[PDB]
């Protein structure tokens with residue numbers, strides 16, 4: 236009745252710790268929500284271990300109190316520039332004419348047994364499709380009849396050391412790390428429906444530093460990618476354009492920003508403190524949107540031409556390649572006004588801002604786009 240699951244993300248602008256309770260119908264009951272503005276981490280990783288330990292424990296302490304429980308283990312969200320993916324294929328004999336569960340384990344281990352690059356470590360082994368004698372597109376093949384079976388898997392890889400620092404901070408707080416999970420995978424478990432997965436969809440988590448991408452076609456995970464340019468780059472463009480402190484460029488962006496310059500009133504204006512003991516700067520909301528907008532299109536175009544690069548790859552191998560469900564933009568930096576209409580002009584398909592699904596309890600606090608990554612760590616963990 237009461238085996239909890241805890242998800243922890245040490246983001247670049249936030250440290251989210253959520254305690255969830257899994258219910259009989261698969262829905263996760265959110266009973267604790269902890270948060271802390273991130274500290275001690277720069278554009279690379281950890282630059283002060285004791286600094287992030289303070290902020291990690293602060294979020295854990297907040298979640299521990301809200302749920303009246305004692306956290307002992309977590310599912311740590313992992314991201315970063317050096318995440319990569321591989322698509323492999325295996326093959327194994329359907330002995331006994333009937334598919335055993337051991338056969339699926341054997342054929343998945345066969346496909347993943349390829350030669351992974353030096354200094355690279357396999358993080359996730361996700362089967363995507365099975366084939367039993369000319370019949371493809373199979374997801375649950377156990378119990379069926381056949382002679383030869385082929386399996387296709389998605390291999391998410393990382394580096395041997397790119398998570399060593401954040402694992403210490405969690406352990407320094409007296410916590411076990413149950414599993415490292417790619418943020419894009421966890422984000423896809425929160426905002427994506429199985430209807431959207433079959434129809435073909437791509438989920439993009441726009442955080443403060445990274446852009447975690449996952450593309451699903453035919454109900455199968457086909458692509459994962461991190462792009463290390465997110466909300467902080469938009470801020471630095473505002474601080475650069477108007478000569479402002481980066482802390483007040485982040486403030487004017489959250490309160491007055493807009494990724495679409497066509498929907499801003501002409502005479503709305505916001506004051507801006509300048510750098511170097513110089514006076515305020517009274518720009519206009521539409522002019523400010525004229526700086527935010529082209530940064531968002533350039534970022535989403537980096538994602539668009541990787542989808543296009545993926546579709547042509549999938550289209551040639553006879554695999555479902557069209558994204559009919561569209562794009563789901565989640566994450567904290569996805570809450571800017573006019574982003575959906577702005578992202579529509581880049582992908583030329585339907586776009587929607589996604590929030591975590593299949594949760595109860597404290598949805599008021601957790602059903603936010605900047606919680607999709609850490610809520611998905613709960614959805615993954617209960618399996």
Ligand SMILES: Nc1ncnc2c1ncn2[C@@H]1O[C@H](COP(=O)(O)OP(=O)(O)OP(=O)(O)O)[C@@H](O)[C@H]1O
Nearest residue numbers: 246247248249442443444445466467567568571605
């Ligand atoms: N209303 C808003 N408009 C524009 N940007 C916003 C808004 N609210 C938040 N952001 C941006 O969201 C970013 C942080 O989002 P989020 O909470 O998802 O980050 P994170 O999980 O710490 O980071 P990452 O996923 O990159 O590790 C910041 O860069 C901030 O500027």
Ligand SMILES: [Mg+2]
Nearest residue numbers: 246442566608
């Ligand atoms: Mg995030």
Ligand code: NI
Nearest residue numbers: 317319352355
């Ligand atoms: Ni590499």
Ligand code: NI
Nearest residue numbers: 341344345348
């Ligand atoms: Ni083997």
Ligand code: NI
Nearest residue numbers: 550555556557
């Ligand atoms: Ni086609």
